Design a protein around this ligand. Structure first.
Ligand code: CL
Ligand code: CL
Ligand code: CL
Lengths: 304, 300
């Protein structure tokens, strides 16, 4: 007696480097106007969060989907799936979402993570989360009116966390460059928000940019290799204000078969959602001594 | 007493950063020597064969690149304690026969109680350096007149330079009276009694102090409308600590302030730490962007 819901992927806005923010109208229609939309990555999962016309959660219409870029000209297709609380697929079963007629609000999360007691998701450091963002018009939450089957056109989603990337190049005298099991440890970042603090995500609440601490850390254990023998390591970090504090970055690398450790102490940092904080480091041999040199672009606003 | 006619040996200018086996004969081997700048002063510091100060043979000279070759000529002069000429009334140097050690300073600053000169931030000092063979202290044996060939001199402080470019939407870019203020650099006021310059002591690379600061009020303009500001800074260990650069600029007629926080820096004598900062308009908002270049060593 209901209606089958066929959701159509809207893609995502990938993470970009910082540049001075649009201090304008909430919601912002100008920040993403010239931003390209990428296809949702093949094998990723999305959670469809349904609300009634009064913006109240409808747990019964909560559905998870598996992405397969199997459409016309490599387009994305969404397959009903069953996931764990972290959004990883656990079973085969493809049960379609059937809904009654009416007007509903809907939000998206990727990975298809489980909703907590406060109506949002549990998110720490060392993870990415694409979702509905009320900060921009392009990604803002939409309503659908349901009248056999109906096509649900999904708006594009955007990153809720910051991203840090380290490219480590093999410089003068470096023949072999690998990651140690200890990898890259980022320290002095935001400690993840408590489950006792209220967050009304459906009405526009977003992760705060509060002061990080000496005890919160994240470890990157995996890196990819470029043709030039350089390593690329990346991770998600929660939005954190460390403008008055330091963020230490410890790189544990195996240079020419010997274990080494290098520390980058980074002061004056404002890590925000949807941005990449890219670093390019080079391991060199000066005499017999191994050094790490790095470079990175920095942006600061007028204080006056 | 023999008349001393000193002949300028030039100087090794400040370069961008790029080991230890003292004295080092390899660091400066392919480095070019510049002529001492016209109007600058040099102070001659004389010691006996046992390396004891001879205050009576202390002399200051004024540089004039008037030499029959295009060379620097040294004219006896009278200076203030900061090395500025107060009179160019030339009284030549006359010395008795024997063996003497000699050191050079530029500007011709006055020697303090410890036998060195008072140096702070916001100044350059060229001098004799025992760290390199080319600039190391020499002895002279005096036997009517004698020509004293001076070895080249080199910088005792670090140098910082900021090039501020006029980026997208920037029509006018000037310095405010507040200019560029650098803090978190070595404290000149943190005194050492343990300074024996004649036997090879050099300025320590101390951890900086936020209380220690310097202000650049003057800048030059490049053809592309960019500004160039620079200053001397005493050797600073900003590897684990930061240097703060506050740039007070007038962008398109409005006063602005930007903070650069720099880290992973070991600022040493004779080196230039150069920054290229661009003032941009993103929407209506003005930003400053630059590139960090840091280095760190293996701890293992
Ligand atoms: Cl963004
Ligand atoms: Cl200089
Ligand atoms: Cl040098």
């Amino acid at each position: 007696d209901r209606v089958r819901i066929d959701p159509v992927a809207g893609g995502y806005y990938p993470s970009i480097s910082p540049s001075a923010q649009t201090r304008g109208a909430t919601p912002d229609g100008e920040t993403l106007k010239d931003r390209p939309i990428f296809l949702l990555e093949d094998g990723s999962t999305i959670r469809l969060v349904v609300y009634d016309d009064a913006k109240n959660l409808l747990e019964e219409y909560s559905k998870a989907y598996l992405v397969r870029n199997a459409g016309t000209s490599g387009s994305s297709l969404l397959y009903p799936c069953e996931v764990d609380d972290n959004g990883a697929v656990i079973s085969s079963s493809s049960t379609p979402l059937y809904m009654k007629a009416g007007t509903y609000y809907f939000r998206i999360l990727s990975p298809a993570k489980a909703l907590n007691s406060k109506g949002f998701v549990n998110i720490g450091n060392g993870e990415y989360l694409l979702a509905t963002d009320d900060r921009y018009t392009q990604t803002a939450m939409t309503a659908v009116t349901i009248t056999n089957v109906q096509t649900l056109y999904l708006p594009p989603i955007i990153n809720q966390t910051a991203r840090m990337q380290f490219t480590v190049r093999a410089g003068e005298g470096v023949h072999t460059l690998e990651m140690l099991a200890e990898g890259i440890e980022i320290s002095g970042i935001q400690q993840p928000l408590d489950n006792t603090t209220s967050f009304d995500w459906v009405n526009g609440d977003v992760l705060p940019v509060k002061v990080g601490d000496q005890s919160a850390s994240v470890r990157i254990t995996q890196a990819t290799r470029n043709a030039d023998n350089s390593l690329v390591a990346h991770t998600g970090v929660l939005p954190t204000d460390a403008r008055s504090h330091s963020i230490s970055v410890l790189l544990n690398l195996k240079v020419n078969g010997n274990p080494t450790q290098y520390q980058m102490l980074l002061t004056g940092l404002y890590l925000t959602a949807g941005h990449s904080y890219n670093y390019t480091a080079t391991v060199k041999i000066s005499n017999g001594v191994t050094v790490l040199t790095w470079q990175n672009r920095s942006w600061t606003e007028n204080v006056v």
